[PDB]
Amino acid sequence: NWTPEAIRGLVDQEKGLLDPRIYADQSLYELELERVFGRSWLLLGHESHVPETGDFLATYMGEDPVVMVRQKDKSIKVFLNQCRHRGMRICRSDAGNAKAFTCSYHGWAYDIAGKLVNVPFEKEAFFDKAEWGPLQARVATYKGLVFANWDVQAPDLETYLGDARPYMDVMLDRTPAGTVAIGGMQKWVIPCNWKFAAEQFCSDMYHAGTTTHLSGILAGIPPEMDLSQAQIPTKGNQFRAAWGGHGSGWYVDEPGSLLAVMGPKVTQYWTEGPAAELAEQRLGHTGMPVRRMVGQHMTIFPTCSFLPAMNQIRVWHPRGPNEIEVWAFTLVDADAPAEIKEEYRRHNIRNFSAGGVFEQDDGENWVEIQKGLRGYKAKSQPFNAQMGLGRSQTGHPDFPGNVGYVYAEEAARGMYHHWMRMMSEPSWATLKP
Amino acid sequence: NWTPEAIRGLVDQEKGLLDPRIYADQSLYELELERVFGRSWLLLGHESHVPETGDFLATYMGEDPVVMVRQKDKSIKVFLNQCRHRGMRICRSDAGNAKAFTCSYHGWAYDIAGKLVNVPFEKEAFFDKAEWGPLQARVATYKGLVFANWDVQAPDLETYLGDARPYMDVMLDRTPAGTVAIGGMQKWVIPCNWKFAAEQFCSDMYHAGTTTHLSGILAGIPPEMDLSQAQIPTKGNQFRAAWGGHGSGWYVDEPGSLLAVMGPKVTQYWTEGPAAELAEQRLGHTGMPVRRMVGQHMTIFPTCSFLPAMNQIRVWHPRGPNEIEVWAFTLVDADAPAEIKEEYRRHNIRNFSAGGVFEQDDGENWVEIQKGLRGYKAKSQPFNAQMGLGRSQTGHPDFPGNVGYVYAEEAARGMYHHWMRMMSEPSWATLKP
Amino acid sequence: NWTPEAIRGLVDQEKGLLDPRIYADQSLYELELERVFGRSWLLLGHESHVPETGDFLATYMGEDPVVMVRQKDKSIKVFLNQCRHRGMRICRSDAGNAKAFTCSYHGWAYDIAGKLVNVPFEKEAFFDKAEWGPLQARVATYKGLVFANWDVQAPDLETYLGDARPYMDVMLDRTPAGTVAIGGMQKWVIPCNWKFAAEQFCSDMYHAGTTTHLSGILAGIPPEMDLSQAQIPTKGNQFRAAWGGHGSGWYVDEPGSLLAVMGPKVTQYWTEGPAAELAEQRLGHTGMPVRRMVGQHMTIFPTCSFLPAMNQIRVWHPRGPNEIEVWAFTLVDADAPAEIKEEYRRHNIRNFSAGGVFEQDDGENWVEIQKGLRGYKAKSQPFNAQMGLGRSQTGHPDFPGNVGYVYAEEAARGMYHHWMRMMSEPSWATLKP
Amino acid sequence: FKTFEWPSKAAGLELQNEIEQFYYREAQLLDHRAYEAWFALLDKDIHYFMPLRTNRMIREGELEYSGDQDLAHFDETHETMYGRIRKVTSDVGWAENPPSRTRHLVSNVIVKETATPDTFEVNSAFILYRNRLERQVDIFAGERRDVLRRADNNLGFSIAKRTILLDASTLLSNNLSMFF
Amino acid sequence: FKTFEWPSKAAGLELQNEIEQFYYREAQLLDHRAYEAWFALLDKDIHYFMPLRTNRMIREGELEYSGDQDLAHFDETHETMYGRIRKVTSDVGWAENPPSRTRHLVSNVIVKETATPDTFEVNSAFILYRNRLERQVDIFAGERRDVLRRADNNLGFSIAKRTILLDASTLLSNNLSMFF
Amino acid sequence: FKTFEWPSKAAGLELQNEIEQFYYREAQLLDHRAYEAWFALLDKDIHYFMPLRTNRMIREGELEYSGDQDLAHFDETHETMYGRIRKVTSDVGWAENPPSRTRHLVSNVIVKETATPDTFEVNSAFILYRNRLERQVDIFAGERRDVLRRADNNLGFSIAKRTILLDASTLLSNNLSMFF
Ligand code: FES
Ligand code: FES
Numbered sequence A, B, C: 001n002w003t004p005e006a007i008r009g010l011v012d013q014e015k016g017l018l019d020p021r022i023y024a025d026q027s028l029y030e031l032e033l034e035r036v037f038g039r040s041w042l043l044l045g046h047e048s049h050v051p052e053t054g055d056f057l058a059t060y061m062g063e064d065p066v067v068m069v070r071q072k073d074k075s076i077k078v079f080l081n082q083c084r085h086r087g088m089r090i091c092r093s094d095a096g097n098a099k100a101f102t103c104s105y106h107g108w109a110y111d112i113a114g115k116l117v118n119v120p121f122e123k124e125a126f127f128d129k130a131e132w133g134p135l136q137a138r139v140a141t142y143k144g145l146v147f148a149n150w151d152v153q154a155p156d157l158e159t160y161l162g163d164a165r166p167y168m169d170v171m172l173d174r175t176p177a178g179t180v181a182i183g184g185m186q187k188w189v190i191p192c193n194w195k196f197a198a199e200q201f202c203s204d205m206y207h208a209g210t211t212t213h214l215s216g217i218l219a220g221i222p223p224e225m226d227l228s229q230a231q232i233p234t235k236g237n238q239f240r241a242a243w244g245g246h247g248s249g250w251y252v253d254e255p256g257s258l259l260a261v262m263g264p265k266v267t268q269y270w271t272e273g274p275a276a277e278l279a280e281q282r283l284g285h286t287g288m289p290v291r292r293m294v295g296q297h298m299t300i301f302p303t304c305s306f307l308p309a310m311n312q313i314r315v316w317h318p319r320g321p322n323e324i325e326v327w328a329f330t331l332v333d334a335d336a337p338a339e340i341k342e343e344y345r346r347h348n349i350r351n352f353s354a355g356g357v358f359e360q361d362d363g364e365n366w367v368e369i370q371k372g373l374r375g376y377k378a379k380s381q382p383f384n385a386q387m388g389l390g391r392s393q394t395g396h397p398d399f400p401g402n403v404g405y406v407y408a409e410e411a412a413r414g415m416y417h418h419w420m421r422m423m424s425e426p427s428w429a430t431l432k433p
Numbered sequence D, E, F: 001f002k003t004f005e006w007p008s009k010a011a012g013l014e015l016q017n018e019i020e021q022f023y024y025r026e027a028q029l030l031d032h033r034a035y036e037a038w039f040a041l042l043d044k045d046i047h048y049f050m051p052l053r054t055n056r057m058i059r060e061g062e063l064e065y066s067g068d069q070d071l072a073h074f075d076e077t078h079e080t081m082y083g084r085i086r087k088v089t090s091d092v093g094w095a096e097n098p099p100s101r102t103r104h105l106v107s108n109v110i111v112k113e114t115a116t117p118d119t120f121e122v123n124s125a126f127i128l129y130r131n132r133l134e135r136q137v138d139i140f141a142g143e144r145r146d147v148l149r150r151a152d153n154n155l156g157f158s159i160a161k162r163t164i165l166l167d168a169s170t171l172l173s174n175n176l177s178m179f180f
């Protein structure tokens, strides 16, 4: 039995130490589904995935299957994809349009709201249908992105995010028209813990600026150029949220990072022109130089990770301590030209799909770590998270919040600290922002 | 760790509620092999599987491999398929004829009784051979069906069945010659809990009369007829056993169920002619209109399931909380004509094999439910078992015992109640009828 | 939870009883990794696997991936194949030569000693590198064979082996030139517990002298010869170590076993000639006639197993209670003729590889035992380890140490007894010889 | 079922090509859910058979397969196959709605002539890859023993008889919702 | 993607053999990591495409595959393919260093002619067996739809277009570091 | 081992067919446990070799396979192969009694001529599906490099040499009780 005392000792943000058991222990994972995933805001997709009435999307909240469906009154409703009679899946396809939902086991019928409307042979065999509908979740939308939470005790989405909102708006609020999701959702399986993937997009630029993506950059630079010239970025910053365990990292004034991954046509759209002029004008309350921010990574705790400068968005669905499913999609501006939309589509496939020149090396690292953690001695000594320890300060003229150096693990320590808090503190009164 | 108090809270027959954890919990499953499968009467097959001296059948009791074998004195003996030296399998083939069983590891020899008769280099290295034979099970037969039980303190098979015997006799007791098993046993693996399968044949006609088998009926009805003409039987009765957790359900008068599944020649044999009249004459002591009974389903607790009308019999072998093996065979009257036996053979393959038009939809439901039960929130709220609640009565003029409506969950509540009792009551003094 | 009292009840060497749960229980296995594999001397390979400076071999210590490397000063160093930053595998190939090791995740550079020499952006983002290198193991070589141990409080290799050393010298110390390993490491997976495999090479000639290898000998004897003339070896002896749970068994004088397995050339080389007489003189002072010893098996606790006469050595790497990996190689005398070296190579592949005519039947037994142990009743009754009980003597006129008959389980009782000791005695103060 | 009795004189290049091409076309029909188009290939006198396979000692090896009077995985006629086609194409056919993704890889085609002109006994090996829903993967392997008649259709042949010998005792799959 | 519309008049024995042999030679290049040699087969105007595949009810079965304006597993031109080749042959390409062990089993080759001389539309099925590091195994099955043009290389043909239909919704492998 | 040195001009249609048919007949023998009939295909000078395969960095890729002086999975002569046949057909040979259920799917056949008349260097790909006892499934993939000689037997050819390159480092099967 994991006592609150034992859980607090797994993460030490003061010394910068992480107990490797957190990625491997079966008992800890069981608690994660309750303490972390059961009461966090989890990403399900975009409003454009379910644009019209009756449109649905079958996705996951932890290991719980859920149905995200647009209603008649233009609202989005999320309910558990489980019939309360004997546990059968109500919505058995990936996506589409439904006038109603019906269970294939015993014929219990449901409306698009997720309410039990008809029970076969109810009068002869039977109890109120209003009470026996599938478990509903709280639905909140942040400028396109749809989030869900089971817990009524949990704070609202706006307060949950905190000062991480400005960095989300770099991707989500460049035009008054908003964003739209490109069709299709990539799905693949990685045998590793979700925290390895969540931490990397939270704080780990360190892997991209060193060895992991040497061949990834090589793939994107012109045939006439090799890694010897490839401009190496060193200047940048890292953001840690005041509350939540949210983190972000970006390069400052270095085109070679975005040029190799996204190409010249995307960079032209992102940094120059009236499109980039409107982006800096709309994001004036922050005081950020968004035209100078290139190659950004961000994680909204626990499992919402994205890359603003390349619009790569993904959810990590947990599948035990030793496995995850990656569900990835891409965003473009609603009023973005057909030329720029195709450039974002092609380059995100080339880089961040299962066969993507960057994604291949990302998974390879995580797969090998998880294997090693099967051993006793490999879990007996803590991991090092001492990078940028006590070097971040809240007084920065351009980037708001707790900001340090790009190659640091302050946001990483912030993520594991918030993980530890959620796992050890049962009440939201102590846990609130 | 599960206390008796905690186990009793998992099942509530009064309110009609089931805790979904009973199908998924690994701790509960480990207790089942001890408290349930370790002391229940379990189906191993039929007498005709082992008709001559030396004939054997390698099967399972729970997860324990066992050998069912006919002796010289016409008796059947069941012992553990494990050598007590170092655990090697004694009988290594599925079925056949043996003069003596020998271990392949160190050559410990056994007779067909299961007794250790020879140990190589015994006079040189050694102990009593009469004490070191594999563990023997109790063997009892009910009208052909061979059952087995490890527990010497357990009740005899006759009392164990109780008032469920009349409903077994509908399939088993029709001719003085008895039943005979059609050769060959079908085996396949379903990723679900054994209780889902046990409950369906016990108390679930509701699935067959609603949505599950709509395509199965479509496959059976004449090519000229479509589903809109197919009869929808509603009249029928369900039976709950006085003790044991057994249950049976049947349609009354409406032949649309049997005519589609078994065909016109089997329905004729079951309801009309001398063969049907003799069966009613033989089952006069029970006082049931057996010719009116069509499309029956039954489960002998825990894992002996059969369909008394179509003569499909199956054992659910547990393989963890998330898996079962289905072992299925078919019975016919011994003195029945060749045309009837061929009709039973063909239609049982067409409907109830791994590729059967019914079985396909049966397993598809169970696979989805088990997958759903991986989630935290999917196991947080109870399943509804409130169908036919407090409507069954013992004063039925046609059918004996606790009889209610065909579309009900009274037998289901009784199954999960007796399961709850076996898991919580460690001694037979309180458990027995 | 496993108390010291409960662990002692699992093994009874006085009554010769073994609790089958030791091979199947998950909790016991997790304790094995700490109390047995975490502080035992474990065979990694041979000196000739890493002959030059920088030469490495990636292998395992239990489930911990380890790197064995020859240093500049001819010493051998063993460290954990895990980077202390975020767990990535430092050495990602099976074998070869390296001037340095580098982590592919963040670029942490290591020397061939396992010392952290360089961290990218260390002066900019940070911490002492001397404190953050992979966990080092104690390295000790016994006449070619390289052993490793994590525990600093554990006794040295010589003391650990004890009076089992003269029996190791039968294979390892026949010539002043020593032994050399033939190239190539055979690796395959068997779904069984490591203790079955370790016990077999420890005390089980009984299986080879009975039923397991009747087809293996048939594969080795001349085409004109059948099992009737194969010659049945019955005479021989078995050795149990004073401390450690080490054991060895061999035939005496009877050449029928060695001739079939290794052929006429090796059998002659082992018994008659200048090479065999040199071994007689070198190992005569230990009071052991090696020319009479024909066909031998030996286990160094826990997982180092070898067959002296055939020179087949193997390490059993545990992969849970239900699985092992077998890593096997072959030894030859360093100064042995090319013809003898080739016969050793050919016959070891023929007999002991994954497709070996002996190995095939060895694994087949263990697979079926492990499958059996899934059942409740299959683990309820103890296994028989009573063979040769109270029949071994420490004053044997032919062989040193505690010596009994070849078909006995004295060395087996000693192995499981020492296993029980390591599992119940946390401190080396009481455990040591 | 013993080793297939291949003729000493191997089939002609054209006939070998035609029958191989027929199987590739048949596989395409099945792998793209053209069930009604596939059902048209089956003759009215078809016997679609998949026997049970058991673990037997070498001494009892003649009892490895289930007989004509025993149970089987499939033992179908034209009328029973029609029902299965009506089920697989149905909206209420939950086992194949949503439908599975399958791949019939066909090789090892041996062609034997019979006494009846334009009718051939054909032996071939297969691997059937079945992917279902999110994560479910079922892999089947075996041989097919067919009787093929020359027919005037899109594929060139019709199926008179089919016996599938599956390399399995206990089926590792939960169902057989696919056609072999 | 519907059933490959094969011609009634089947391709000649010589052409059938030539294309089959091309695929066997191609498989050998890929299975022995001859990436430079394999890349040379790709024409300037190559479209290398592998669409996403989703679970849909039969009623909405038209939405199974991802469209032209949707994401995919692969959507590559000659220039983007070149970058992938530079990564896989790179000593710092960790996903394939140490490299995987692959087998491209090819069968079910159907050959169709086009309007352009020496240009052929080809359909074939595959099983790709991928073994990585110590014990990792990933098995893929599907079909390929190629536009091949006659070329004066050591294989006989060059690849103008390739569409790979993989029998998977969610990919069970952690990456697609291999070429199909 | 590098990419198989295929001839620029492919083998004739009749020769290609003959060798393909030989492998299909060979697979039938093995899959139906005709071990005596299969063993008769092996010449007196047979070398039956299956080297170990290791994980190596790209720069040490020349050391991927075990050499002739190293250990292997198989390194056999006619003498040692006869012993294996006597074991596998034995009633006391427990690893294959009860026997396994195997399927050899053969494709990718490339035929090359030699300096010796009626002797051919043959490359082919395989998937070996092995089903054993209740639920054991082992899947093997790889290539075979054969030297075949024309012979007056029922299959048309005899085997002079066979090298099997398995797509595995660590064997995921508990044994290799089958023949490749
Ligand atoms: S499970 Fe949904 S109605 Fe029975
Ligand atoms: S296990 Fe049966 S004799 Fe040793």
Ligand code: FES
Pocket: C083, C084, C085, C086, C087, C088, C103, C104, C105, C106, C107, C108
């Ligand atoms: S894990 Fe070794 S450098 Fe980050």
Ligand SMILES: [Fe+2]
Pocket: A207, A208, A212, A213, A358, A362
């Ligand atoms: Fe990355």
Ligand SMILES: [Fe+2]
Pocket: B207, B208, B212, B213, B358, B362
């Ligand atoms: Fe049903």
Ligand SMILES: [Fe+2]
Pocket: C207, C208, C212, C213, C358, C362
């Ligand atoms: Fe042995």
